[PDB]
């Protein structure tokens, strides 16, 4: 009795964040190939994020064949096909078929430096338009081609936000940040896995979820010498890089003696939030 | 529901509920259903083709509902003379047309039998029958469906159809269970359990065919095919009753004297009258307020349930002098047309039935509003409906002290159309010639009439049992012994619960060519034994002249061992391919095996010399594996098979 | 299986709360229902 | 308030069905209680001097 | 006659006192003010969690 098998990559997530990526002032959008990749090194999505199937989702899975690979930087979802071809999935796949992820926290101070408003909201990103009990505007998940990162456009509330938790069937002990839904075919030929006979894509589809970091006004406190000074303008928070303030000209009120004093960048872990600017206290 | 607590107290009658088991192999049942929904409490159909996992046949029934009743009891009486006395005969005969939809009590058996949980597809619903002697079907594309359907399912291991032999040809029956054996090889963790398509020679329109001979040409797959599945033979007898239902039964009436229009008739002279509707239309045409309101209320609404109640002893007089009427087409027909007319009143184009069933509704609503609000008082008659609903029976009465403005108005249309259908009627007394007082009549209706005929008929009624294919009771006996012995025993010699016997008599010179057979597709046996009831007799598959696969225990065992190992393997998709995966890989297979050695499953004094597995560069792999991404496992195993021959040898002792 | 006990800032509470000088708990209970009413059905033993 | 029609000056009212009219309060209040009938005889006497 | 005091349209049950043979007075239900109260509707599920 031989038995054989062979398996294919079906989709690819790209996950990403500016707080662990950029350094300082410069925007990893914008490094180049050497830049980029020793950024990389020292990433791994999991340092803060949790993402799993939900049970719905596990089953399906199982009987289609469907399996769950990790990396550092993204998911991998593989597929197995018929024996003897790269596009046949071994198992017919119809439109209306999907797969559901939960997203949850890990990292006590991701809502200190990612510069996104979540209070009593859910994050939900798609495919294909759903349909919800209130008037709503939707975009999709961006591809990997695109610019831009997670604002308001993806958050839901109210009606939607029960609606939308109910039909994923959540446990009572919620502590969901968000849900991806994706389904075979979407709204488009661009975002959908397989053709219309069913074949896999020759081109594996490759999306993209990437979360913007927050600036802050700095501030110093001298007790010993009794004097208070402020940046002119925000910073960006980061968790490696470095930015050197050495100028008299960068503060407002600089000390008399300014030329002996070092001035430490700010931690993520206390910060001020208000409508307008945000603080970090910084004690010398 | 109910309201005080407390302890109630109902009379019932049905079979004692089964234990519920444990998890073991798990069938899949594909067939029609009665509801198929998500939500008992809705109407939706949502399961149509959506797998579900049932644990016993009390949540199958809150799912997809129960049987279909049987449209084909007849039942005769027969009046006469014997020389002037009185003779009676009742007679109810076995139904000849029977409703094609056996998915319910093919699961009574299979819990009665002793399996566990499994998966129901339901491809449809039943459908009504066009008459009495023309019942619905069985449309083989909906099975299709429910098999491609299956596919995607990973826990069943067996295959059932449980109305396959009803599907309208031979050839069609064939065809399906090809397809179940070329779907258990395209995934090799699957068996199929088969059936003949009838026990009795039965005919293809052309010729007339031996269903053993028939089957074996039926399937006409290979070696690779037949491996996985076996058949069994004969049908049995249960003990199961049909389900019917008494208000569907209707009386034929013959006899010496008929008097079935006579007795009609005098009914309606009796209606047609001041003590049976004159009296009801001439009557129907804050808290102390409430009170008052809702003692009138009741008045109406009783007034209009007697009318209600009238209508319905009327149709159930003229449908006896209808049925009655065998001559005379033309009478049938003027008979009819009354009563049609006549029942518009009641019925939805003017619905005398609602007014008084919304009445009571708003009538218990009323009363209760007095619990929290003056506003509920005011709400039930102007924002809800009592004012629109006594609207409908005078449209502006309240116009004068004397009803007036009847502009439209539910009542008294009946005296006319009662006349109307008196005089339909009427027209065929000297049309009868041999119908009898309760002919066409309801058995729920004639209890009252005759009690003595009504209970000597029913006993004869359930009298008649029903018949069924082996195949669900098999998956039953499968699941008792997975349990008790293990995969590796043979399936064989096993009693059956709820059977009377087989269908037919095999004996033990007829299952010499069951058993074997040049061509190797062997069928095994039901048969009753002496002072041990009916045993299943043989375990071979349909390879049967196969020295590796002929028996069910090896195939089904290696079915089970190939699961459990694929899912250690399926672990490593993505992982290097090097000695670090080698290792993890041969032993956690390793671990199992030697557990299924140490169960018993295995031959051999040690491990060493039940099992081997090989993994890994040198053994199984080469530098072109390493290149292609290729990992290679081999595996053996040895395997305890069955004594089938028990020969004694007698002789004369010497001394 | 019985219950959950939530409290902390990323669980309960944000920047806000720290600021404010809240302190957010969020607790969970399985609690047993009684039985009302209890139906005895009769019938002949067939045999 | 009684186990008996009471006259209210105005009308004879039935004793449960008045409760619930008096007691006009939301979901919100009508948690924090349960009321029971009838009123019980007891085996005690009543104070008295000769 | 219990059966209107114990559910009904507006949730305002009544407990009632009765009378049983061989056992003599008893206290017959256990049901809160808001009776159609999926989650409040007994008194014991209100005294524990206070």
């Known amino acids: ?284 | 529901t109910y309201k005080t607590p407390g302890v109630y107290i109902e009379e019932i009658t049905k079979f004692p509920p089964s234990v519920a088991q444990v998890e073991t192999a798990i069938p899949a049942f594909i067939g029609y259903t009665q509801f198929a929904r998500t939500k008992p409490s809705v109407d939706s159909d949502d399961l149509i083709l959506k797998p579900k996992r049932i644990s016993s046949l009390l949540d199958f029934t809150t799912y997809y509902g129960g049987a279909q009743n049987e449209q084909g009891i007849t039942v005769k009486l027969t009046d006469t003379l014997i020389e002037g006395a009185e003779n009676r005969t009742i007679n109810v005969p076995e139904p000849t047309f029977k409703s094609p939809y056996l998915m319910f009590y093919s699961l009574q058996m299979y819990f009665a039998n002793g399996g566990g949980p499994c998966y129901i597809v339901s491809t449809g619903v039943y459908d009504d029958w066009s008459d009495s002697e023309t019942p619905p079907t069985i449309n083989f594309s909906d099975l299709e469906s429910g098999l491609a359907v299956i596919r995607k399912e990973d826990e069943p291991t067996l295959l059932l159809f449980p109305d396959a032999t009803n599907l309208p040809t031979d050839d069609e029956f064939y065809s399906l269970y090809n397809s179940a054996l070329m779907q258990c090889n395209d995934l090799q963790d699957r068996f199929t359990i088969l059936d003949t398509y009838s026990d009795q020679t039965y005919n293809d329109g052309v010729e007339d065919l031996d269903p053993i001979p028939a089957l074996r040409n039926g399937i006409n797959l290979t070696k690779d095919y037949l491996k996985y599945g076996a058949a069994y033979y004969p049908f049995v007898q249960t003990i199961l009753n049909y389900q019917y239902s008494a208000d569907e039964i209707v009386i034929q009436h013959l006899s010496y004297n008929p008097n079935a229009i006579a007795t009609a008739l005098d009914n309606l002279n009796a209606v047609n009258g001041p003590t049976f509707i004159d009296a009801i239309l001439d009557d129907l045409r804050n808290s102390v307020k409430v009170a008052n309101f809702a003692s009138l209320v009741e008045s109406v609404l009783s007034t209009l349930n007697e009318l209600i109640d009238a209508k319905e002893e009327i149709n159930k007089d003229v449908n006896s002098a209808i049925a009655s009427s065998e001559e005379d087409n033309a009478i049938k027909t003027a008979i009819s047309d009354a009563l049609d007319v006549f029942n518009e009143d009641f019925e939805g184009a003017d619905k005398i039935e609602s007014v008084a069933k919304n009445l009571s509704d708003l009538l218990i609503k009323i009363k209760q509003a007095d619990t929290n609000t003056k506003v509920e008082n005011v709400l039930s008659i102007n924002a809800l409906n009592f004012s629109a609903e006594f609207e409908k029976l005078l449209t502006y009465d309240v116009n004068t002290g004397l009803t007036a403005s009847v502009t439209l108005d539910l009542f008294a249309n009946i005296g006319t159309r009662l006349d109307d259908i008196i005089a339909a009627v009427s027209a065929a007394e000297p049309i009868d010639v041999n119908n009898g007082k309760l002919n066409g009549r309801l058995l729920s209706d004639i209890e009252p009439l005759d009690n003595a005929t009504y209970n000597t008929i029913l006993l004869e009624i359930n009298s008649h049992k029903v018949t069924l294919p082996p195949s669900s009771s098999m998956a039953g006996a499968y699941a008792r012994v997975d349990n008790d012995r293990g995969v590796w025993k043979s399936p064989a010699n096993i009693g059956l619960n709820y059977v009377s016997k087989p269908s037919v008599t095999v004996s033990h010179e007829e299952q010499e060519s069951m058993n074997v057979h040049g061509t190797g597709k062997s069928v095994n046996a039901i048969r009753s034994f002496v002072g041990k009831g009916t045993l299943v007799w043989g375990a071979r598959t349909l390879a049967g002249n196969d020295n590796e696969w002929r028996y069910i225990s090896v195939r089904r065992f290696f079915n089970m061992a190939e699961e459990s190992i694929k899912k250690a393997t399926e672990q490593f998709v993505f992982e290097p391919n090097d000695g670090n995966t080698w290792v993890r890989v041969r032993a956690m297979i390793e671990n199992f095996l030697i557990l299924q050695w140490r169960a018993g499953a295995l031959a051999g004094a040690k491990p060493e010399h039940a099992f081997y597995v090989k993994v890994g560069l040198g053994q199984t792999m080469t530098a072109q594996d390493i290149l292609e991404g290729n990992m290679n496992v081999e595996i053996g195993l040895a395997v305890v098979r069955p004594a089938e021959f028990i020969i004694l040898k007698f002789s004369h002792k010497m001394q």
């Open chain 1, 1 to 284: 009795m031989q038995v054989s098998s062979s398996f294919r990559s079906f989709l690819k997530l790209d996950i990403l964040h500016s707080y662990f990526l950029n350094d300082g002032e410069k925007d990893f959008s914008s490094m180049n190939e050497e830049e980029s990749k020793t950024q990389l090194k020292s990433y791994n999505w999991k340092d803060f994020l949790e993402i799993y199937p939900s049970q719905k989702t596990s089953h399906m899975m199982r009987g289609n064949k469907i399996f769950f690979k990790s990396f550092n930087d993204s998911i991998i979802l593989a597929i197995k096909v018929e024996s003897g071809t790269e596009n046949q999935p071994f198992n017919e796949l119809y439109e209306d078929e999907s797969m559901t992820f939960l997203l949850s926290l890990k990292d006590q101070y991701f809502g200190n430096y990612t510069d996104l408003d979540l209070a009593d909201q859910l994050l939900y990103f798609s495919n294909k338009t759903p349909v919800l009990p209130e008037a709503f505007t939707f975009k999709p998940i961006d591809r990997i081609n695109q610019s831009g990162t997670v604002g308001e456009e993806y958050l839901y509330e109210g009606e939607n936000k029960k609606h939308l938790l109910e039909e994923a069937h959540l446990n009572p002990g919620g502590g969901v940040l968000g849900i991806i839904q994706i389904y075979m075919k979407g709204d488009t030929p661009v975002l959908s896995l397989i053709n219309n006979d069913g074949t896999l894509k020759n081109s594996l589809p490759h999306f993209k979820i990437h979360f913007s970091n927050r600036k802050s006004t700095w501030k110093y406190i001298n007790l010993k010498d009794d004097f208070e000074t402020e940046t002119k303008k925000d910073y960006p928070l980061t968790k490696f890089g470095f930015i050197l303030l050495d100028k008299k000209s960068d503060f407002i009120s600089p000390p008399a003696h300014f030329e002996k004093y070092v001035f430490p960048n700010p931690d993520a872990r206390r910060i001020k939030i208000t409508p307008t600017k945000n603080y970090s206290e910084i004690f010398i």
